[PDB]
Amino acid sequence: GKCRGLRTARKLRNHRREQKWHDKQYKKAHLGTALKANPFGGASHAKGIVLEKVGVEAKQPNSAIRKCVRV
């Protein structure tokens, strides 16, 4: 269980800080990965140049052609 000692503020502060890295939402925003791999690099929008016009098909059970662009 938890240590309720009056001098356990160091043990609690160190335990909570370590267990926060097992959180998927926390480890994603406090590491080099998931930001270096992010093509936008942490921006809202981005400009680009259209390369091709590819159409990806929708997954099941849908059936359509999604009009996409290779930018």
Partner 1 sequence: VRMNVLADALKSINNAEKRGKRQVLLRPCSKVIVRFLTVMMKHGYIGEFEIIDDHRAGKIVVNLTGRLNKCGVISPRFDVQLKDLEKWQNNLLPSRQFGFIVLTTSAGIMDHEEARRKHTGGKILGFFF
Provide the token pair at 8. Answer: 């356990």
Residue 11 binding: pick among partner 1, RNA, none (C-beta 5-8 Å cut-off by kind): RNA
**Beta carbons of 41 and 29 less than 8 angstroms apart:** no
Which residue type sits at 53?
Answer: K
Provide the token pair at 4. Answer: 């309720």
Helix (H) / strand (E) element for 54: namely none
Residue 23 binding: pick among partner 1, RNA, none (C-beta 5-8 Å cut-off by kind): RNA
Residues that bind RNA (CB under 7 A): 1-8, 10-12, 15-16, 19-20, 22-24, 26-29, 31, 33-34, 37-38, 40, 42-45, 58-59, 61-67
Residues that bind partner 1 (CB under 8 A): 4-6
